[PDB]
Short mmCIF file of C-alpha atoms in Angstrom, two decimals:
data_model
loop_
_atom_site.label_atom_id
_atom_site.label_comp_id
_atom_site.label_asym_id
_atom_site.label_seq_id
_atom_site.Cartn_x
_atom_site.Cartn_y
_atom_site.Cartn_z
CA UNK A 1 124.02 125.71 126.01
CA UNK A 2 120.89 124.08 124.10
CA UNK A 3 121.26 120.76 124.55
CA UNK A 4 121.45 120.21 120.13
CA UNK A 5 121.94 123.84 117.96
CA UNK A 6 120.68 124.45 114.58
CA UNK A 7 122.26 123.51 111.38
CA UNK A 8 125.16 125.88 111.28
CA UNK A 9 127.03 125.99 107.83
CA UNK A 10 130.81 124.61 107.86
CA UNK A 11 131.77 128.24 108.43
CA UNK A 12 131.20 128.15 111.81
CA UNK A 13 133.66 125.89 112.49
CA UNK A 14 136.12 127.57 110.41
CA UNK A 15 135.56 130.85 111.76
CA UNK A 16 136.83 128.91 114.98
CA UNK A 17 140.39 128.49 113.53
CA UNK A 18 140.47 131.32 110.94
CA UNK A 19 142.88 133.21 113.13
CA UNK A 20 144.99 130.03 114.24
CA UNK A 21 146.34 126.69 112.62
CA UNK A 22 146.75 126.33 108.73
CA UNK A 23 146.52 122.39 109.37
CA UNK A 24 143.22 122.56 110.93
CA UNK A 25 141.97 125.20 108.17
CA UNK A 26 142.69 122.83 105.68
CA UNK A 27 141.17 119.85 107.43
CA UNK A 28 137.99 121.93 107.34
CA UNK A 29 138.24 122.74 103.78
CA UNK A 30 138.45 119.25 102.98
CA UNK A 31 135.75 118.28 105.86
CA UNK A 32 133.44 121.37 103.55
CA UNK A 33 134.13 118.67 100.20
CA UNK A 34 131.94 115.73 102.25
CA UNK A 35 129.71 118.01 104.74
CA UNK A 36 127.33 120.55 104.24
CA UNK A 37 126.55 121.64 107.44
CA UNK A 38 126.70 120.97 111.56
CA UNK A 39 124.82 120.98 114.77
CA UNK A 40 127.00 121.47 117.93
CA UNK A 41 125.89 119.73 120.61
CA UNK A 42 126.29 120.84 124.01
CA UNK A 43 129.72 119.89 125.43
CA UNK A 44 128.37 118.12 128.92
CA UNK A 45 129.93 114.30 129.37
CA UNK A 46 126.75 112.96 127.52
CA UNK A 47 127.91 114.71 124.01
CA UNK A 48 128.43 111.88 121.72
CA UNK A 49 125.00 110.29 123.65
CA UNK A 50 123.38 113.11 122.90
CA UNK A 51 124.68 113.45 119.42
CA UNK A 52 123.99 109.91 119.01
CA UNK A 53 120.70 110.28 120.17
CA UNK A 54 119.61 113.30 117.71
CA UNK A 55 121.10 111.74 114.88
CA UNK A 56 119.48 108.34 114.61
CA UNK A 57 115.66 109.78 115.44
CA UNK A 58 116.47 112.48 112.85
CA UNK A 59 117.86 109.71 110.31
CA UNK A 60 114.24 107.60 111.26
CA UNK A 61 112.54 111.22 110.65
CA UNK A 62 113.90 111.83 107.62
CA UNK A 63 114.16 108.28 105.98
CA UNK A 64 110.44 106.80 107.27
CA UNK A 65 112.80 103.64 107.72
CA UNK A 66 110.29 101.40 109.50
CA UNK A 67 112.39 98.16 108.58
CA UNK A 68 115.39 100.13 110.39
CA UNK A 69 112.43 100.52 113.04
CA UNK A 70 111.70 97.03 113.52
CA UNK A 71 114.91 95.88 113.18
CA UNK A 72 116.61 98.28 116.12
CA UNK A 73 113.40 97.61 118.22
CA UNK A 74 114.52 93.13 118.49
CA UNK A 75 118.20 94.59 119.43
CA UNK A 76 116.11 96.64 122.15
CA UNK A 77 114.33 93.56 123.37
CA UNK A 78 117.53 91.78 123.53
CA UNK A 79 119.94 94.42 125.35
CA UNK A 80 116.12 94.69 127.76
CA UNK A 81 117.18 90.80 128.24
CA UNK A 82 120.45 90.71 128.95
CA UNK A 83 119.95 93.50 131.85
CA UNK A 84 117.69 91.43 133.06
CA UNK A 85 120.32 88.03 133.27
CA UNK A 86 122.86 91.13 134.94
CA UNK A 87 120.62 91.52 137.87
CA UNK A 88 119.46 94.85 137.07
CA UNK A 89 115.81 95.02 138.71
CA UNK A 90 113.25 96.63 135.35
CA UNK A 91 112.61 99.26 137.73
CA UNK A 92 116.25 101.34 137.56
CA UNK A 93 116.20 100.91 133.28
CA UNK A 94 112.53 99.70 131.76
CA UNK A 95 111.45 103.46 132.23
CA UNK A 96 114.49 104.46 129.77
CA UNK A 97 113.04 101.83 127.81
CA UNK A 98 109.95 102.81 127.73
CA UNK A 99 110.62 106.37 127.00
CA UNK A 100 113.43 106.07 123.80
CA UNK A 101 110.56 103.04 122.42
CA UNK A 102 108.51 105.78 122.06
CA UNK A 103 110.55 108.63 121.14
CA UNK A 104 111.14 105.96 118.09
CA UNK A 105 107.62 105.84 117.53
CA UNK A 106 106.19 108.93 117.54
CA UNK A 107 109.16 109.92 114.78
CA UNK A 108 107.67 107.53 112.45
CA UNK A 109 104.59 109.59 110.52
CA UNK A 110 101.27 108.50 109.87
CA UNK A 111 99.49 108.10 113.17
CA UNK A 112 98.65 110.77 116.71
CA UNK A 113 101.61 111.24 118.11
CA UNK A 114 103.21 111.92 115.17
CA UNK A 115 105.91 114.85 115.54
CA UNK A 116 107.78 116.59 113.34
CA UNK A 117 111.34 118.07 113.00
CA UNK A 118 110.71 120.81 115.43
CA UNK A 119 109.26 118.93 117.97
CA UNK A 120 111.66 116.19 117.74
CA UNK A 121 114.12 119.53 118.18
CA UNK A 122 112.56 120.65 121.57
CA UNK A 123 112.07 117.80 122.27
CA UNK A 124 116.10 116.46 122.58
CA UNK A 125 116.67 120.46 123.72
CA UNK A 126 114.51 119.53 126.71
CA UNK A 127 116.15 118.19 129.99
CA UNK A 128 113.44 115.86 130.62
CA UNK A 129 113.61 113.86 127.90
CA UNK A 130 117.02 114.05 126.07
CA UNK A 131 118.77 113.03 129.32
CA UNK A 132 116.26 109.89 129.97
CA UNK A 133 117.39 109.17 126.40
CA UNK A 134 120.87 109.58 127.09
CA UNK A 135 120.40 107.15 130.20
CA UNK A 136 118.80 104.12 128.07
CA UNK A 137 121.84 104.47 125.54
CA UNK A 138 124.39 104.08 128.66
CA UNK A 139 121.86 101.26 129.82
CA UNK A 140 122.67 99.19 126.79
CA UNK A 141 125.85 100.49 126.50
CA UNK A 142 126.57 98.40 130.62
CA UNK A 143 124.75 96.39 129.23
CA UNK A 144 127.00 95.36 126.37
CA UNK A 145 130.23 95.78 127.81
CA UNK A 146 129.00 93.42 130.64
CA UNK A 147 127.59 90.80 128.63
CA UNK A 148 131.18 90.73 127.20
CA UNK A 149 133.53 91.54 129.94
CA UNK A 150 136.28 88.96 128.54
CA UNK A 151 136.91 90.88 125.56
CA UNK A 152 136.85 94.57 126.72
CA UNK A 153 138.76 93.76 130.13
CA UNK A 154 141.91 94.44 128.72
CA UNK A 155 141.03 97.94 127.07
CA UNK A 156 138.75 98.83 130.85
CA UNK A 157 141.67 97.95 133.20
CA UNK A 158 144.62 100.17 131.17
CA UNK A 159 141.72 103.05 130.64
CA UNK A 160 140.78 103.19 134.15
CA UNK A 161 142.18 100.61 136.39
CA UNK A 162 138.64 99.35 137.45
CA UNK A 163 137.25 96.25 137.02
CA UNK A 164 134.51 95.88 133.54
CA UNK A 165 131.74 95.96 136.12
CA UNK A 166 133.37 98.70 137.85
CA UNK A 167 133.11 100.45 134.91
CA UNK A 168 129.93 99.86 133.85
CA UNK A 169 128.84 100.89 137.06
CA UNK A 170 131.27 104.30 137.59
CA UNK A 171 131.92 105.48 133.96
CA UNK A 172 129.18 104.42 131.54
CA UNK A 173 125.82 104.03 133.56
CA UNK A 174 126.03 106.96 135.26
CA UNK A 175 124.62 111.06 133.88
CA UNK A 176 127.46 112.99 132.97
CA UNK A 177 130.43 109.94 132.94
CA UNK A 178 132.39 111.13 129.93
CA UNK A 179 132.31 108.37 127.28
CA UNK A 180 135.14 106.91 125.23
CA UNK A 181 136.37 104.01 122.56
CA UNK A 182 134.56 100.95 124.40
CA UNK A 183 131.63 102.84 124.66
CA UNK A 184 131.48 103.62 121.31
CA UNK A 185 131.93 100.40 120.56
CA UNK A 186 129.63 98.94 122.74
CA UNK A 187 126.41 100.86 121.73
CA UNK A 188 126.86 100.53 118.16
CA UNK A 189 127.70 96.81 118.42
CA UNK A 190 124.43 96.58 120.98
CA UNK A 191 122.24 98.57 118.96
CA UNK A 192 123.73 97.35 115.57
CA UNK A 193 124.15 101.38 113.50
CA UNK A 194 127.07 102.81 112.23
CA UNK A 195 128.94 105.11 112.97
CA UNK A 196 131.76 107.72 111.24
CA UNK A 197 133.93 109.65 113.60
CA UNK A 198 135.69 112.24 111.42
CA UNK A 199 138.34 113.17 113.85
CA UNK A 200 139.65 116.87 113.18
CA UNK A 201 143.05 117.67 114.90
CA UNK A 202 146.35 119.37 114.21
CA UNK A 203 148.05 116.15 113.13
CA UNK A 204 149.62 115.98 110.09
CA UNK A 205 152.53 113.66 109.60
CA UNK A 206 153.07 114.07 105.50
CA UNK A 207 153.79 117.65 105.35
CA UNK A 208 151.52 119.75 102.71
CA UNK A 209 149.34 116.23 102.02
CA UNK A 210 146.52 116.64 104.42
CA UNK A 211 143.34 114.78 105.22
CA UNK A 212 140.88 114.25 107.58
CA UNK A 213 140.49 111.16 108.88
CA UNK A 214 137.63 108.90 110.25
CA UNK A 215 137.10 105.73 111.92
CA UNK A 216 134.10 103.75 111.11
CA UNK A 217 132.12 101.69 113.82
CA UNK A 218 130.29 98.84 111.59
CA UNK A 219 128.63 95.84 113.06
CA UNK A 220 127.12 101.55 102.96
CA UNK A 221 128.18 104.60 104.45
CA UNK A 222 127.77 105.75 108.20
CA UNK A 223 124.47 107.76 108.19
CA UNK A 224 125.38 108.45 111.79
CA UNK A 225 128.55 110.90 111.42
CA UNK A 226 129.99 112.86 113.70
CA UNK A 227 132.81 115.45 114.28
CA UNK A 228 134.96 114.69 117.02
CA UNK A 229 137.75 117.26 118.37
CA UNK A 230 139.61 115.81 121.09
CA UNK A 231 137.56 115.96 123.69
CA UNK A 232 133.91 116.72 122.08
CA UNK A 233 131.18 115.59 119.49
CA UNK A 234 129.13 117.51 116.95
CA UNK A 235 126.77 116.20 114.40
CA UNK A 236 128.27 116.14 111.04
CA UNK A 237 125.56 116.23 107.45
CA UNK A 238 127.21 114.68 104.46
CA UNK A 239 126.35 116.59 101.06
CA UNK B 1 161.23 91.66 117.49
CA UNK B 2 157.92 91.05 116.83
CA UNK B 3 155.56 92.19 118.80
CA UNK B 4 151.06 92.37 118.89
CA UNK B 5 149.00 94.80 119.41
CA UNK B 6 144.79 93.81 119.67
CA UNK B 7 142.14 96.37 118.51
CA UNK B 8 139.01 96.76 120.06
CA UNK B 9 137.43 94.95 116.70
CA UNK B 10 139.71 91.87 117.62
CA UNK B 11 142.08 92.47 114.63
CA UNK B 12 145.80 91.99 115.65
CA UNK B 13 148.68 94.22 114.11
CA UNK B 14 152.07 92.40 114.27
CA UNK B 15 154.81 94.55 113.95
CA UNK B 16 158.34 94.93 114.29
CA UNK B 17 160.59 96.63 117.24
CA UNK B 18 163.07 96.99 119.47
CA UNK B 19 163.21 96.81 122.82
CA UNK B 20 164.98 100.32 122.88
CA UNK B 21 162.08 101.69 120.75
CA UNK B 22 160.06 103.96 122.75
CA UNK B 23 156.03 104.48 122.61
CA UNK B 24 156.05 107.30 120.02
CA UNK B 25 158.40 105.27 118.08
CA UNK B 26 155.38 102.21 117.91
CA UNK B 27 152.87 104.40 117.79
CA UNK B 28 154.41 105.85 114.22
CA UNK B 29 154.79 101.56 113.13
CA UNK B 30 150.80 101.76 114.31
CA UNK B 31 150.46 104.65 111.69
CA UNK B 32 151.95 102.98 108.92
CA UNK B 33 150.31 99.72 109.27
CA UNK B 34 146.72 101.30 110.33
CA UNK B 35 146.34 105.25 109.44
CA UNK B 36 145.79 105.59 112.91
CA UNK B 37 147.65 109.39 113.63
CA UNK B 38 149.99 108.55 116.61
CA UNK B 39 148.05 111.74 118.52
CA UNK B 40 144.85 109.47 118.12
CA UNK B 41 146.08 105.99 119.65
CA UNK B 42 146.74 104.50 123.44
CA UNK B 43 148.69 101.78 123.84
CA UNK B 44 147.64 99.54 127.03
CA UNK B 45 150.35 96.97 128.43
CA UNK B 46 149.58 95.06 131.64
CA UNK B 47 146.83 97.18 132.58
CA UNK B 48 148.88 100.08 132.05
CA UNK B 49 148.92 102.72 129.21
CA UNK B 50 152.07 103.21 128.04
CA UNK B 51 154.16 107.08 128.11
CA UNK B 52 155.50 108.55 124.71
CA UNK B 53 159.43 109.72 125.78
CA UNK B 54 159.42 105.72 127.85
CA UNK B 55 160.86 102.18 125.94
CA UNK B 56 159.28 99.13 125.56
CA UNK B 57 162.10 98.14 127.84
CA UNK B 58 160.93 100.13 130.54
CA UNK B 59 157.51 98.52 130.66
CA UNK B 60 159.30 95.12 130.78
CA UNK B 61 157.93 94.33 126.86
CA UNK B 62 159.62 91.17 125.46
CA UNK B 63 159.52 89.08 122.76
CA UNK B 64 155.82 88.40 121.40
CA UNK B 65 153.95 90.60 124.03
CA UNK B 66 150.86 91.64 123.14
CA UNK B 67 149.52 95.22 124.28
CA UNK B 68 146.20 96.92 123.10
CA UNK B 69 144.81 99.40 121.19
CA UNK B 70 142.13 102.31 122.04
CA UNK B 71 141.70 105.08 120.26
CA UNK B 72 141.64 108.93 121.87
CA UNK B 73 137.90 109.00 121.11
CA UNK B 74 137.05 110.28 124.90
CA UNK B 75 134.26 113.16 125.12
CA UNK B 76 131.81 115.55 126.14
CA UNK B 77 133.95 118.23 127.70
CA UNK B 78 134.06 122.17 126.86
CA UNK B 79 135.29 124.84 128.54
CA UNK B 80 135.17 128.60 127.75
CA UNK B 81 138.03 131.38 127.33
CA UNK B 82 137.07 134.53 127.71
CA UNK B 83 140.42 137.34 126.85
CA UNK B 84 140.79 140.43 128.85
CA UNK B 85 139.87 141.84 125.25
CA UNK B 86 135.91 140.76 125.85
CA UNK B 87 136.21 137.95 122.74
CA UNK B 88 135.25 134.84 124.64
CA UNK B 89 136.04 131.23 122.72
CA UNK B 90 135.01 127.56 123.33
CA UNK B 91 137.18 125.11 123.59
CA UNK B 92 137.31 121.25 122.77
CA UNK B 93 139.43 118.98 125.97
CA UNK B 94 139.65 116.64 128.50
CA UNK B 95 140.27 116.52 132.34
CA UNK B 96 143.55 114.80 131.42
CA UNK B 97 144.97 117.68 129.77
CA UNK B 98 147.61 119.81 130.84
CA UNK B 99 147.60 123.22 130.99
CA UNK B 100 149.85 123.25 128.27
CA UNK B 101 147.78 120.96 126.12
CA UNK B 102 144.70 123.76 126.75
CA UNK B 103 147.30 126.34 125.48
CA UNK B 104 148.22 124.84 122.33
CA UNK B 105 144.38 124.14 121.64
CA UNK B 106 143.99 128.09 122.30
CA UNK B 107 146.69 128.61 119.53
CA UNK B 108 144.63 126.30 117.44
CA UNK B 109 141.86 128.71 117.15
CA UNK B 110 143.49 132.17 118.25
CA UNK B 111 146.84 131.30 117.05
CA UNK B 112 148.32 133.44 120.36
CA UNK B 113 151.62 131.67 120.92
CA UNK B 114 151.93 129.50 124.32
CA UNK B 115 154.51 131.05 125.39
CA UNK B 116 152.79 134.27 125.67
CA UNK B 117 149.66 132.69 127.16
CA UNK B 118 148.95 132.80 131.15
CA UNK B 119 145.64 130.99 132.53
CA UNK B 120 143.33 132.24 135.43
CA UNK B 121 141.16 130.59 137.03
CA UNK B 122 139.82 131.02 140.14
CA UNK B 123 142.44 133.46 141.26
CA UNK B 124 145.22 131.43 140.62
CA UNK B 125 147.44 131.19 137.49
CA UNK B 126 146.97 127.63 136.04
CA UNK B 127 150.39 125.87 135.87
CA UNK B 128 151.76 124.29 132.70
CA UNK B 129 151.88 120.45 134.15
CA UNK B 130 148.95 120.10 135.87
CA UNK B 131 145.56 118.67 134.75
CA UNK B 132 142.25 120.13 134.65
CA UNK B 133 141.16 117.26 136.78
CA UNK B 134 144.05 118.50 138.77
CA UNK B 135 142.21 121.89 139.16
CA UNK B 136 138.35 120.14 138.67
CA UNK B 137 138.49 122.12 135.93
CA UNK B 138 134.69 120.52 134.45
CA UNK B 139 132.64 121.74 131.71
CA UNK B 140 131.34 125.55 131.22
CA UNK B 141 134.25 126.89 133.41
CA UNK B 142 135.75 129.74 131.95
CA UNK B 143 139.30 130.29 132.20
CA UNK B 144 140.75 133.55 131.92
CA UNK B 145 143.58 134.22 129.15
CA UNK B 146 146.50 136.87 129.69
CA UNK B 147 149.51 137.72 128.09
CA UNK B 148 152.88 138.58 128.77
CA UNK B 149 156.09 138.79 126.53
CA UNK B 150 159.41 138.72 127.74
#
């Protein structure tokens, strides 16, 4: 149950379906030609939050990317805006804000808070943290899908059968509300990174010519990838 | 007949049909246009999604009606597995699975047939149409695999 696992080698996951289907076996042979290595996320409703989470302030870690800083922290201001023109009071989302802002921060070397990867590890393995981070993303995430109802009220009402603001409200702001398409969409969209979903499941429709595939999420390859098996995220690492 | 589907990146695939097709059949025109897998789409009409073995007739589709596109991208859920032979397994699903979905995910990784596989949870066996939002079945639960022959 920790909240993000080490990197695990590919194996893992093939020791998983060793003793069951040849077409997922071979997906994860060819999945081992593009990725090195996993971390399985705990499989709550806040997975691909969580996985979305760990990925990006690892990619900042590892890449010193302060233009990538900068640039994510104006689509911050403006998702903190458009809350604002929703009626959402500062006090039920600035504190998310506040605390992801400086999760971004203190990722970026140089200066006193300064953490490394182990920290930023216990850090997103600790309750009270990682799910305050997994809160701002479904903040912007309402936020997004609100600030365009017209276009995603067609998807919401066939999903659900709620209203976009019912929604917002039921499926994406609140802890645990299992996430889906739109809100994929939404957050990358809001936040403006990409995302690869290599999607790993039995289907094969051109017997003995299998391959895994993805769907991309681009508002230059993903360097947020994840595995997806119906129903859960992991973090993928590309070799 | 022509007919649109919109994708959630407001691109529009026009494709062919008849009214007598049925959702699996445009799900497989879907494939060939897109490389979407027809396991990985859901087609949305009228605020509806639309059933594999039903026709376009049957959701009253005509001529130039447009339905829409998500894909099956819904997570986190797992639950556990545990056999009566100690191994216990995780497993990948959703509360809109049925029973029998969760058994051909356990063949996935075990490779046990289905039709050898019996479910227990909470002192019940699990039956093959129902949900495990029919049971609230949520995450961490572990069902309880046995087997029988015939």
């Amino acid at each position: 149950l920790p909240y993000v696992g080490d990197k695990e080698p590919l194996s893992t996951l093939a020791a998983e379906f060793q003793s069951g289907s040849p077409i997922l076996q071979e997906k994860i042979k060819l999945l081992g030609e593009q990725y090195d290595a996993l971390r399985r996320t705990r499989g709550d409703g806040n997975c691909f939050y969580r996985s979305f989470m760990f990925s990006y302030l690892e990619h900042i870690l590892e890449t010193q990317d302060k233009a990538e800083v900068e640039r994510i922290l104006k689509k911050i201001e403006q998702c903190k805006k458009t809350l604002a023109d929703l009626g959402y009071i500062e006090f039920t989302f600035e504190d998310f804000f506040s605390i992801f802002i400086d999760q971004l921060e203190s990722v970026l070397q140089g200066h006193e808070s300064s953490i490394g990867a182990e920290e930023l590890l216990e850090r997103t393995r600790d309750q009270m943290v990682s799910d305050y981070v997994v809160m701002f993303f479904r903040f912007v995430t309402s936020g997004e899908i609100q600030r365009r109802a017209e276009f995603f009220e067609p998807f919401i009402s066939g999903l659900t059968n709620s209203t976009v603001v019912q929604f917002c409200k039921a499926s994406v702001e609140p802890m645990g509300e299992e996430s889906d398409h739109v809100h994929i969409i939404a957050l990358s969209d809001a936040l403006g990174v990409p995302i690869r979903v290599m999607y790993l499941d039995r289907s094969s429709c051109d017997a003995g010519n299998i391959s895994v595939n993805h769907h991309d999420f681009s508002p230059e390859k993903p360097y947020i990838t994840l595995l997806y098996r119906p129903g859960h995220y992991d973090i993928l690492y590309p070799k | 007949m022509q007919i649109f589907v919109k994708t959630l990146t407001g691109k529009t695939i026009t494709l062919e049909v008849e009214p007598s097709d049925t959702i699996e059949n445009v799900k497989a025109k879907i494939q060939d246009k897109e490389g979407i897998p027809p396991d990985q789409q859901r087609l949305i009409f009228a605020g509806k999604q639309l059933e594999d073995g039903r026709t376009l007739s049957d959701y009253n589709i005509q001529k130039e009606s447009t339905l829409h596109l998500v894909l099956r991208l819904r997570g986190x859920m797992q639950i556990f597995v545990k056999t009566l032979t100690g191994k216990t397994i995780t497993l990948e699903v959703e509360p809109s699975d049925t029973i029998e979905n969760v058994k051909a995910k356990i063949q996935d990784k075990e490779g046990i047939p289905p039709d050898q596989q019996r479910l227990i949870f909470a002192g019940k066996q699990l039956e093959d149409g129902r949900t495990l939002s029919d049971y609230n079945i949520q995450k961490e639960s572990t069902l309880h695999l046995v087997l029988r022959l015939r």
